Every structure is written in C-alpha cells, then in structure tokens.
Amino acid sequence: MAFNDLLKQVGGVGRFQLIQVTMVVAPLLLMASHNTLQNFTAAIPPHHCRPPANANLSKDGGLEAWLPLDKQGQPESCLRFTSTEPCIDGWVYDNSTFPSTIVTEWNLVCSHRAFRQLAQSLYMVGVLLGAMVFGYLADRLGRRKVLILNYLQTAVSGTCAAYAPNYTVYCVFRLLSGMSLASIAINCMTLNVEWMPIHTRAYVGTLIGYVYSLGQFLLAGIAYAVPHWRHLQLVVSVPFFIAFIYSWFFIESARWYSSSGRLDLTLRALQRVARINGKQEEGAKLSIEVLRTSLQKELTSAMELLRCPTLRHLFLCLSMLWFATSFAYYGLVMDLQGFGVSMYLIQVIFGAVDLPAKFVCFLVINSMGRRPAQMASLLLAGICILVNGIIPKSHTIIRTSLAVLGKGCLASSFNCIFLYTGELYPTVIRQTGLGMGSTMARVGSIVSPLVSMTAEFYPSMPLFIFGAVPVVASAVTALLPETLGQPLPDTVQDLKSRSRGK
Amino acid sequence: QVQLVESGGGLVQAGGSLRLSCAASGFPVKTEWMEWYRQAPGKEREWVAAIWSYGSGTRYADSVKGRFTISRDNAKNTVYLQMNSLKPEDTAVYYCLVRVGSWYHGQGTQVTVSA
C-alpha cells in the first residue's frame, strides 16, 4: 500500500494526469528548437573583403578585381588584394539565402571563426551547470517552483539574447538559457514520472521521445517560415513566456512532499487531484492517519560510487559510452551547412527518421539483444559519419543520406545507453548512475563544439574525431556484460555475484 | 627574401607560341599556391590559371579554358607557361604570385600579340 496505491486510488489515468502531462511536456518542442537554434542562426553565407571606397567599383569591372579566387572559384573569404592585406573594411554577405545571422551581423568569419563555436560551447556549459545546480536546488526547494523559474529564465534569456547588442552579452545569455533549458527538461521528466503511476512510466518516456521528434520537425518548419535570426529567436523563445504564464496552474508532486517530511500538503494535493479528477468520496476516504500507514516504508553519492573498484570500472565504461554518444550526436547534428542541401529539408528528414530508429532499436533490444544493439548502432554510426567525412563534397545525396542514417543510429544508441545505464546499475545508486551518465553526456556535448572549432587546420579533422570517438568507445565498452536476463541488480552485494554468475 | 624576376616579353604573331616564367627563390614549386594574372590596358587584374601544392591539378578561367597550357618545373624553381593560338585581346602584362593573395609578386612582363 505504497504511494502508488494511493495514486491509483484517485484515478491514475484520469483527465488531470493527462492534462498535466501534456501541459508539462509541450515546451520540449521549444527545447529542441533552442538546442539546434545556434546551428540554424549561425549559418555562414558566402563572404569576401569589401574593397575600400578609395577607388570606385564601377571602374573595377565588378567586385572580382580586388578579390582573389579560392579552389571552388568563389572570392577569398578573408583576404583581399592591395590594388596583400587582410579584410580591414569589413565583409560583404549575400542575402539571397540567409538574410541575417550572427556571423553576418558581427563579422564572425575570419580570425573570429572560433567564436561561432564558442557561443555554442558556452550554451552547453550553461546546460551542464544548470542541470547540476538546478537539480540540487530542485531537491532542496521544490519542483513546481523550479519549473516556473525555469520557464521565466528561459523566456528572459531567449528574448534578451536575441536582442543582444554585443557578442559577450549574447554568449552569457545563451549560457543562462542553457542553464534554464537543461533544468526544465530534467524537472519536466522528473515531475511527469513522479505524478504518474508505475504502469505508465514507459508510456511517458515514449511520449517524451515523440515530443522531441515533433519539436525537431517544428524547428524545421518555423525556421523555414522565419528566415531572420533575431526574429527566429523571438518566435522560438516567446512561447516560453506564455508557458510561464500558464505554468502557475501546475500541481507539484506529492511524492516530494512526503519525502520532505510534511504530510498536510500531501493530503491537500491528494484531494486537489480528487476534485480535479471528479472523484470526491475516494479523496474523502484519505485522512491524516492513513497517510503514515501508507508511506511508512517511504518516509523511513559520487564518493560511494567511486570507492568500489569494479563499480568504478563499470562507471568509467558507462561514462565513456555516454560521453562518446552525446559527443558524436552533437558533432553530427550541428554540421548541416556542409551537406550541400537546404537546412530545412535535411532537418525535416532528420525529424522523420528519428522515430523508425526508435522502433528498430526497440525491436532488437527486446527481441535480439542489448549488447549487439549497442554495438551495431554505435559502430555503424561512427563508420558512417567517418566515411561521410572522407567522401568529398562533390557528391551530396550520398552524404546527406549517410548522415540521415547516422543521426538515426545515434538516437538508437541514446535509447540503448539509457536502457543500459538504468539496467546494470544497482538500485542503490541507479539514480546516481543516471545522473552521472547524463553529466558525462553533457560534458561530451560541451567538448564537441570545441573539437569542431578546430576546422581551420584541416577541413575534415573535426569530422574525423566525430567518426573516430564512437569506435574507441565501442572498443572500450565491448567488455560490458550482457543483461538480457531477468535478474536485475538491487544492492551492491550482488554486483560481484552477478560478475561471478557470468 | 623572395625574388620573382620574370622574362618572356616580346612580339609574336597570333597563333604562335612563346613561354613565360618567373625565377622564384626560397621555396619550391610543389609546396604552396601559385597563380597567373593579366591586366590589359584599361582592364583589371584578370586571373588566368592556378597551380596548387604537389601538382594537385590544372585549372583555367572561362576565356582561358582549352586555350592555355600551364606547366611547372621543379628543377629551376620556375613555372614554364606556354600559350598557343594567341587571342588578339590577350595583350596584357603577365603576373605570377606565390599564394592566393600574397606579399610577394612578380615585377611584370608585357607581351604583344598584334594580329
């Protein structure tokens, strides 16, 4: 007669739970949109040095007189002739395809090419710091309050970063936006799990995956609709303001209230749900006495994770897997410029291919196996992206399709690694294991733009790293034991016994 | 320093052939960028042909494709460029660089095609 019993006592599949789960999971479309917005608003259009006004361009026979030509025939993107000298009167950007981006507005083309990736790295370190510190603050403070502050901060950061006058302001406010966004995602999934019964957690996860895929599609569509970058960021971040406006109607998880040592608020929330769900007598059956008689068992760290040596090795393996998966995924997703096709179509097809990958991954894990699924997905994705980097830019359809299959394999690998990290870890630190896996994944997502920044030395070195890291990850995680069997570790005593079992 | 003294200027009838070259120093012809530029009287710096490191290939311009021949020479650190069936609009001073935009460039050689 635990908290789950009381949850099914008042509905459990009722209108209140559904309305809250949709009202809470809706902004994840904007989550994905803001995640990929740095990719879609930092598009680099063709550019070249602007000749000085000392000599008129009419007698120059065009702009090609004072512009050296590169390998492909376009004018040089950083350097200019003296009648050499570098770009000293700014750059000229064509607005045929991309009206305005951050690089176009702030001349982040030559000798500033690193800042375009540095802004994304700042957003990712924001995501990591936000996840950590706001998970701590949500455990210490609450869930509904953290969520509403997350909505407010996301909206404020989005607006005041789209209206950034300088670049440092933009990077700092993207840092804050990543903070808020990681916090809202983690607290969204946590609250949805906490207020739903045990039977529907898998349905909640499937819904969140569908929502992310639909958000990718929505980003593609809106970005097709809005060509600018300030206007795109406004139209992507403003709905978070109405999200904050309506998020005061949320009902916080009663499980957290019970874990906080206060039961009157839990009782109040229970009959609040009862009134919303329409069943009044069932809520009236609840009382102060019945609360402790139902949650007596419920009412009554990294260190301990790293003390045990075999646990330390398992943690190192899973951390490497998470790091490599997120690193490759965010190194591949944010390179849509070099596919030779309009970003809208490739983003749409990415969103389309996200789901069949999930289907195939589910089939192989629940029918064939888990370790073969992880191996196939990770190794094949790494090989595909590596050979995509090797294949020259002359061909476009093959590279685009290759990467369309890559992204799907990365999504399947994400599902597989989440299932692993939630499965092999003992229940003592299973949540700690999930947190550490997500933290290492965000560390990888931090590092990946830094690696991609080093594209000035070689034109395929970032892609070579993106394609080589998953291979090393598979090589070092091949030693992970199979876990298709029913036995699921609970404490730390059977971890060595499970190794003894195999 | 780097010196790019060039020679080959003269008068040749249309349809003839004479080779152009600039004597480079301090670098070989198989390591870095190298181009050829024209400027007819009243015309601008028109790019003619390009050679990259290690003989990556051959490439010309719109009015230059299928009409011009460019050949390198690793022995004397020079580029030996020949032209046959001389266009009568190609009266220009020939320039050679050491990169695609560089601090060192040739002094100049002027040829006449006449008729």
Author numbering:
A (entry chain A): 1 to 83, 102 to 318, 325 to 526
B (entry chain B): 1 to 115
What's written in the study?
Organic anion transporters (OATs) are responsible for the recognition of metabolites and toxins in the nephron and their eventual urinary excretion. The founding member of the renal organic anion transporter family, OAT1 (also known as SLC22A6), uses the export of α-ketoglutarate (α-KG), a key intermediate in the Krebs cycle, to drive selective transport and is allosterically regulated by intracellular chloride. The OATs belong to the SLC22 family of solute carriers and structurally belong to the major facilitator superfamily (MFS) of secondary active transporters. Oat1 adopts an inward open state with the canonical 12 transmembrane helices of the MFS fold, forming a binding site in the center of the membrane.
To address this question, we determined the structure of Oat1 in the absence of a ligand. The apo structure, determined at 3.52 Å, contains density within site 1 close to Lys382 and Asn439 and occupying a similar position to the keto group of α-KG. Given the buffer composition of the apo state contained high phosphate, unlike the ligand structures that had no phosphate, we modeled this density as a phosphate molecule. As phosphate has no impact on OAT1 transport we interpret this structure as the apo state. Two further densities are observed, one interacting with the hydroxyl group of Tyr230 and the other sitting close to Phe438 and Phe442, which are likely to be additional phosphate molecules. Aspartate 378 (TM8) can now be modeled interacting with Lys431 (TM10), whereas in the α-KG structure, Asp378 is rotated away, facing the α-KG ligand. The second observable difference is that Tyr230 (TM5) adopts two rotamer positions, whereas, in the ligand-bound structures, only one is observed.
